[PDB]
Design a protein around this ligand. Structure first.
Ligand SMILES: Nc1ncnc2c1ncn2[C@@H]1O[C@H](COP(=O)(O)OP(=O)(O)OP(=O)(O)O)[C@@H](O)[C@H]1O
Length: 49
């Protein structure tokens, strides 16, 4: 695994400006959010209005 223990909840209309270092899981989360990263132990349920 290249990422774990991600516990963030964001309702709709929540502008969440992600900041971080040079290579500390910024774009990787941006891709894993869409579903392009293999998730091993994660409870994720995307839903909309
Ligand atoms: N799609 C991917 N598949 C495999 N490894 C990835 C993927 N995307 C990023 N990585 C790797 O995971 C690590 C985390 O990188 P990260 O996602 O933080 O990069 P970044 O935010 O684009 O970087 P930077 O701050 O330099 O712009 C790096 O070693 C990177 O090479």
């Amino acid at each position: 695994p290249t990422l774990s223990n991600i516990t963030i909840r964001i309702p709709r209309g929540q502008l969440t400006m992600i900041v971080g270092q040079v290579g500390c899981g910024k774009s990787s989360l941006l891709l894993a959010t869409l579903g392009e990263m293999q998730k091993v132990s994660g409870a994720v349920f995307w839903n909309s209005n």
